[PDB]
Each structure stands twice: as structure tokens, then as C-alpha cells.
Design an enzyme around this catalytic site. Structure first.
Site, short mmCIF file in Angstrom:
data_model
loop_
_atom_site.label_atom_id
_atom_site.label_comp_id
_atom_site.label_asym_id
_atom_site.label_seq_id
_atom_site.Cartn_x
_atom_site.Cartn_y
_atom_site.Cartn_z
N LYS A 135 0.77 -1.24 0.00
CA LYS A 135 0.00 0.00 0.00
C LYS A 135 0.81 1.30 0.00
O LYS A 135 0.42 2.28 0.64
CB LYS A 135 -0.97 0.00 1.18
CG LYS A 135 -1.77 -1.29 1.31
CD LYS A 135 -3.17 -1.07 1.89
CE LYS A 135 -4.08 -0.35 0.90
NZ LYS A 135 -5.51 -0.32 1.36
N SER A 141 1.67 5.25 2.71
CA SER A 141 0.59 6.24 2.71
C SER A 141 0.22 6.60 4.16
O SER A 141 -0.46 7.59 4.41
CB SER A 141 -0.64 5.69 1.97
OG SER A 141 -0.98 4.39 2.42
#
Ligand SMILES: [Fe+3]
Length: 309
Positions: free
Chosen positions: A69, A255
Site C-alpha cells: 500500500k 501512505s
């Protein structure tokens, strides 16, 4: 500090010189971590062992998937300070004098920057799809390409499953077809050298490669580009003759808790202090003789931040 991820000793070496120089000029600190492949680095960043890494577009989608991610925080900028651009062109380079066009490549030999990379693989194979006679999953796309081209060099490809996709590579012993600088035909310059030496008939690279490797204008005139309209044109006409305009390589990070603001501060300061023709002591966008694209593309002149998320 921001921990950068290297994918080879040459990169690690450059990373340590970067660290020493940032210290010397009292700038933002940078730390180094050595890994072996882009994916390994993706992992390291996911599990807080590192904070950033620069990746070709073909790996952006991967790194953005789970569990990793990771997301892009800064994009490389190309062109000139005059005309900056956050994209480059995927082109097909061939020797001048041949008569074959983009639709007549069956049975020829090819040179690619590497498996799953943008200009060297994703765009080219995507373009040649209608000629590949590929049935689709569960058949690996490599099998369809393996029986399309006579032989080629695709660093990273499984030499055991697709022998001819590695046949033209010039690596030594076990480093043949390696996805790294240990393979001479790796990356943009590597693929172009694979054409120059005559091993292949076509090189899938970026527009600036021919101009960097060949300074003598006389030599550039013995190369052409294959345009998608099935015509051939001079290398300096890449803007009216490319397979695709693609987004630049980007620095990715977590992130969540990605130290995005620190990373950006490091890069902005590194670019200003060690950017193009900025310092005789260290070059952020350069490599010692015999090396190419260490950490960042040699063709880059700076960075551009990607919108908040
Ligand atoms: Fe690329």
C-alpha cells in the site's frame, strides 16, 4: 532521518556518498539501506525498514496494492529547466536501412529494458497485443512473447520457463538476464547497447537514450524510430513518433506514517545543492563511468511533488 532503499552495491555506494555530502553541507539527513530488487525494497518500506525508493511506472501499481500500500510522493522531472516535463516517451529504436515496420516484427530479435517496466515492456507488449496471438490467462504473457520474437533480452524473465527471452542477454554466468546492472543489457542504456552491438533488431527504450549514449550526431543518423502508423522517422522526431507518452518514475512511500514531508524536504534540498551542474563534489543525477541510473534516472533534472492525499 529518511532511510533510502538501494537495489545494488553501486546504488548503496552512491547513497553513502549522498549521506556524507548532505552532512558536509548541513542539509537534511539521509540514511541508506541495501536490498537486491525493487520488490524487496517495496517490502522494506512497508515494514518500516526504509522510507523511500524511486520506481519505474510499471512498479507503481504493484507497490500501491496490498499488503504494501505505498504511494508516490514525488515525481522525477525531465527535459530542461526551460521546458520541464513529468513524462518521457516510450520509443522503438532500430538501425537505419531496414524496411520492416512496427507491424512486421514477428520472428525478429528484441532488446527490452526489463520485465514489467514501462517503456521496455508494458507499452511495447501492450502495443503488439493484436499480433501476439495470446489466448489469455492462465497463460503467462511471456509465453506468447517467447513464441513471437525469435530471441531477445528481457532482464528479470524466468530463464527456465522462457529460455529465448533471455537468449540475447550478455550477463556472465548466473548474472545473465539478471534484473540489475550486473547484466550489461539492463535498463535504457543496456537495451540500446543490445541494439548497437547487433544482438537485436529493435530496442524498446525512452527518447533521450540515443542522445545521451551517442554524442556524435553522425552516429545518431544511423538509427531510426518505428512509429505506430507503420512508417519510420529520424530519432529527433520522437514527439510525432512514439508508442506512448508515459508518467515519470516516482519516489514512493507509505501512505500511513510515510514521512512524506521529510522526504520532500530532503529531495528539494538535494536537488538545489547537488542538482545538474550544481556541485563538482557530488552529482545527484549522475553516475561514475560505466554506471547508469543509480537511485534516480541520469536524465532527471529535479523533482515535482504529487498532490496531497
Ligand atoms: Fe521507465
Amino acid at each position: 532521518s529518511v532511510q533510502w532503499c538501494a537495489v545494488s552495491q553501486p546504488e548503496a555506494t552512491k547513497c553513502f556518498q549522498w549521506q556524507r555530502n548532505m552532512r558536509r553541507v548541513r542539509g537534511p539527513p539521509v540514511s541508506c539501506i541495501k536490498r537486491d530488487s525493487p520488490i524487496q525494497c517495496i517490502q522494506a518500506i512497508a515494514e518500516n525498514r526504509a522510507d523511500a525508493v524511486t520506481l519505474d511506472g510499471g512498479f507503481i501499481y504493484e507497490a500501491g496494492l496490498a499488503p504494501y500500500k505505498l504511494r508516490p510522493v514525488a515525481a522525477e522531472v525531465y527535459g530542461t529547466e526551460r521546458q520541464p516535463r513529468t513524462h518521457y516517451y516510450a520509443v522503438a529504436v532500430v538501425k537505419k536501412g531496414g524496411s520492416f515496420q512496427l507491424n512486421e516484427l514477428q520472428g525478429l530479435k528484441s532488446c527490452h529494458t526489463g520485465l514489467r517496466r514501462t517503456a521496455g515492456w508494458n507499452v511495447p507488449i501492450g502495443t503488439l497485443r493484436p499480433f501476439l496471438n495470446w489466448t489469455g490467462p492462465p497463460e503467462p504473457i511471456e509465453a506468447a512473447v517467447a513464441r513471437f520474437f525469435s530471441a531477445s533480452c528481457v532482464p528479470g524473465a524466468d530463464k527456465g520457463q522462457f529460455p529465448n527471452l533471455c537468449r540475447l542477454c550478455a550477463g556472465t554466468g548466473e548474472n545473465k538476464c539478471a534484473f540489475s546492472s550486473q547484466e550489461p543489457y539492463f535498463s535504457y542504456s543496456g537495451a540500446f547497447k543490445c541494439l548497437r552491438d547487433g544482438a537485436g533488431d529493435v530496442a524498446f527504450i525512452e527518447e533521450s537514450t540515443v542522445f545521451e549514449d551517442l554524442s556524435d550526431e553522425a552516429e545518431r543518423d544511423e538509427y531510426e524510430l518505428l512509429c505506430p502508423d507503420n512508417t519510420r522517422k529520424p530519432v529527433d522526431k520522437f514527439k510525432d513518433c512514439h508508442l506512448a507518452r508515459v508518467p515519470s518514475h516516482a519516489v514512493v512511500a507509505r501512505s500511513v506514517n510515510g514521512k512524506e514531508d521529510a522526504i520532500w524536504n530532503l529531495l528539494r534540498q538535494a536537488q538545489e545543492k547537488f542538482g545538474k551542474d550544481k556541485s563538482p563534489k557530488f552529482q545527484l543525477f549522475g553516475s561514475p563511468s560505466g554506471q547508469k541510473d543509480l537511485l534516480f534516472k541520469d536524465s532527471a533534472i529535479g523533482f515535482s511533488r504529487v498532490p496531497p492525499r
